[PDB]
């Protein structure tokens, strides 16, 4: 599966990059499991935080149906 953050040296995932985060949410808008994406556990936690911060700022939708 191979983590795409360990191989890029990324320190913090960043919630302002709405291209990487879109790859890590599903169509409904929920966060995809690390078991599927092959992300490491450390970057998974960072990634989940970034997605939640983006949702608050309405860069990402919470769900597919409130819009």
């Amino acid at each position: 599966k191979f983590c795409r953050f360990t191989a890029e040296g990324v320190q913090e995932i960043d919630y302002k990059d709405i291209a990487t985060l879109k790859n890590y949410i599903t169509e409904s808008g929920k966060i995809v499991p690390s078991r599927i994406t092959g992300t490491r556990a450390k970057y998974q936690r960072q990634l989940a935080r970034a997605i939640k911060r983006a949702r608050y700022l309405s860069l990402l939708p919470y769900t597919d149906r409130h819009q």
Partner: protein, 104 residues
Amino acid sequence: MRHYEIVFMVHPDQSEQVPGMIERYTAAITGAEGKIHRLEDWGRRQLAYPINKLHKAHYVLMNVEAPQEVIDELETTFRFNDAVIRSMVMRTKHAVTEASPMVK
């Protein structure tokens, strides 16, 4: 002094106040011996979910080194200035001067 990433989003129909608001907040921070490290007016962006039945709001981003007290006062200004729809202040361990992904 701590570092802060401040993102506030303004009403789409108060778009012309954003320059003025930027200058006031920058002046407040800089007057308290602050250090504005980044300032990116992202502009009018399509909200992902309707807020107050308001699509397409005006995003502003600001990365700042400033005392906690001045930062608290700025957050209070947000709480009362009923043109800013949302704000978020985050504490960063170091200063970021690099251009954000939203700039280009």
